[PDB]
A paper describes a structure:
The [name] proteins, [name] ([name]) and [name]-B (ARHGAP5), are key regulators of Rho GTP hydrolysis and are highly important for maintenance of proper Rho signaling. They share over 50% sequence identity and a domain organization containing a GTP-binding GTPase domain, four FF domains and a C-terminal GAP domain. We identify two GTPase-like folds in the middle domain of both [name] and -B which we term [name] and pG2, and show that they are important for GAP activity toward RhoA. Thus, we classify [name] [name] and pG2 as psuedoGTPases.
We obtained crystals of the [name] and [name]-B [name] domains that diffract to 1.9 and 2.6 Å resolution, respectively. The root mean square deviation (r.m.s.d.) between the two [name] structures is 1.8 Å over 128 Cαs, and 2.7 Å (135 Cαs) between the prototypical small GTPase H-Ras and [name] [name]. All five G motifs are degraded in [name] [name]. In [name], helix α1 (which follows the P-loop) is extended and sterically occludes the phosphate-binding cavity. Switch I (G2) is completely absent in [name] [name] due to an 11-residue deletion. Switch II (G2) is also degraded in [name] [name], and places a glutamate side chain (Glu636) where the γ-phosphate of GTP binds to canonical small GTPases. The G4 and G5 motifs are disordered in our structures, but their sequence divergence suggests degraded ability to bind guanine base, and in our structures the guanosine-binding site appears to be sterically hindered by the side chains of Glu606 and Arg739, which form a predicted salt bridge with one another. Together, the substantially degraded G motifs in the [name] [name] domain indicate an inability to bind nucleotide. Consistent with our biochemical studies, co-crystallography of [name] [name] with GTPγS and Mg2+ yields no conformational differences and no electron density corresponding to bound nucleotide. Additionally, reported binding partners of [name] such as Rnd3 may bind the [name]–pG2 region and affect [name] activity. Interestingly, a conserved surface on [name] [name] is observed potentially suggesting a protein interaction surface.
Residue numbers in the entry: 585 to 677, 688 to 700, 708 to 733, 738 to 762
The structure:
């Protein structure tokens, strides 16, 4: 269970073709051995749920009996991986869940254009981390996590 003295972030990471595993691995490299992530000198419990396959399947559901999601980090770098994000979100709709759509490193014009329309439709923030492996800068990870903590307090997640 969650330590009542340490704030918990339950983060879904959504991305096919190994995108979710890769970002989850990066984030865990930044964590303590008991999965704490430090922000502004403060410890947070960080639970990660990387998803790459069909979210219809129980094993791939956003929410489980011990995991209530607080946000979802959506990753893509291609037509197919963008399509996977839309399919997964619209199908598992989790609707007021804070979402972040991130374009990562692997056409460039169309991926940005479509990403922005998808983010508009899903009502979420769009970040271009491709210019910035298929990783994301750790400072950007911390910004997203800070944002989730405030959302968590506003939406009572
Ligand atoms: Na807690
Ligand atoms: Na976890
Ligand atoms: Na996990």
């Amino acid at each position: 269970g969650s330590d009542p003295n340490v704030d918990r972030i339950n983060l879904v990471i959504l991305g096919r073709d190994g995108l979710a595993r890769e970002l989850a691995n990066e984030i865990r490299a930044l964590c303590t051995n008991d999965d704490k992530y430090v922000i502004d000198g403060k410890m947070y419990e960080l639970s990660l749920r990387p998803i790459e396959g069909n979210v219809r399947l129980p094993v791939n559901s956003f929410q489980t009996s011990t995991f209530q999601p607080h946000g979802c980090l959506c990753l893509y770098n291609s037509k197919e991986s963008l399509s996977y994000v839309v399919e997964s979100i619209e199908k598992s709709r989790l609707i007021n869940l804070p979402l972040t759509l991130i374009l990562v490193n692997r056409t460039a014009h169309s991926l940005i254009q479509h990403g922005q329309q998808v983010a508009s439709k899903l009502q979420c923030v769009f970040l271009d981390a491709a210019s910035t492996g298929r990783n994301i800068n750790e400072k950007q990870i911390s910004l997203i996590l800070r944002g989730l903590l405030e959302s968590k307090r506003n939406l009572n997640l």
